[PDB]
Amino acid sequence: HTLPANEFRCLTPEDAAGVFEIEREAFISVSGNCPLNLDEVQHFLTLCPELSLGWFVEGRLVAFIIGSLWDEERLTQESLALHRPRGHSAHLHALAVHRSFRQQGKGSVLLWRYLHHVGAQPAVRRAVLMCEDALVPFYQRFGFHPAGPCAIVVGSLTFTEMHCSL
Numbered sequence: 001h002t003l004p005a006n007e008f009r010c011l012t013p014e015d016a017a018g019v020f021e022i023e024r025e026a027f028i029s030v031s032g033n034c035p036l037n038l039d040e041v042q043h044f045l046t047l048c049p050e051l052s053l054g055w056f057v058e059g060r061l062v063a064f065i066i067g068s069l070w071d072e073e074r075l076t077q078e079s080l081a082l083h084r085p086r087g088h089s090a091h092l093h094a095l096a097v098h099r100s101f102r103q104q105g106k107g108s109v110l111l112w113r114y115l116h117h118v119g120a121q122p123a124v125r126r127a128v129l130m131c132e133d134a135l136v137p138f139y140q141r142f143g144f145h146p147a148g149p150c151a152i153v154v155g156s157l158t159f160t161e162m163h164c165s166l
């Protein structure tokens, strides 16, 4: 009968379009590239939707986290497009908040819910991600520890890998 003021739920492939739209502004306008194109978003939301989370406000997506499983200590280039069903690491591929909803704790709220969400599943023992240097301290607030230069290369951008024990 109405659109809920707030709703948190795992994403589905039908949400791919909304996710990519946010990435356009959140990533592409910044670097001319993003972590997941439409096909890649649909890929993970098809194989492992349970490793995704979305925040909707009045029927519209405002924040999301899309992940998959990884089965190696460190992130690698191939890790970008893979889901290792037998892995024990929740690899956060993309995390973003709609431009009109930032700086109000939504990112922190979503990340914390995500960590508890994935850390409730019988194989996820760790969470891994890569981020720009300036964001390392932000993630340390969630239990993540800096783990050196990430091997993953994206254009002229370099990242610091971070791991969190769950």
Ligand SMILES: CC(C)(COP(=O)(O)OP(=O)(O)OC[C@H]1O[C@@H](n2cnc3c(N)ncnc32)[C@H](O)[C@@H]1OP(=O)(O)O)[C@@H](O)C(=O)NCCC(=O)NCCSCCCCC(=O)NCCc1c[nH]c2ccccc12
Pocket (backbone or CB within 6 Å): 026, 027, 031, 033, 034, 035, 036, 092, 093, 094, 095, 096, 097, 098, 101, 102, 103, 104, 105, 106, 107, 108, 109, 129, 130, 131, 132, 134, 135, 138, 154, 157
């Ligand atoms: C980062 C965030 C999700 C935070 O959401 P928001 O609700 O506003 O945050 P919050 O809970 O209110 O708290 C914000 C804190 O983050 C800090 N922060 C946000 N943006 C920042 C920036 N550009 N520089 C420095 N600090 C920043 C901010 O200062 C604040 O700290 P304090 O004020 O407390 O000191 C939002 O700013 C956003 O949507 N940014 C645009 C998208 C983005 O850059 N997302 C990545 C998060 S870092 C890594 C997260 C791991 C997954 C992931 O997304 N990996 C892709 C890595 C990747 C980056 N660029 C690529 C290009 C191509 C391929 C891959 C990549």
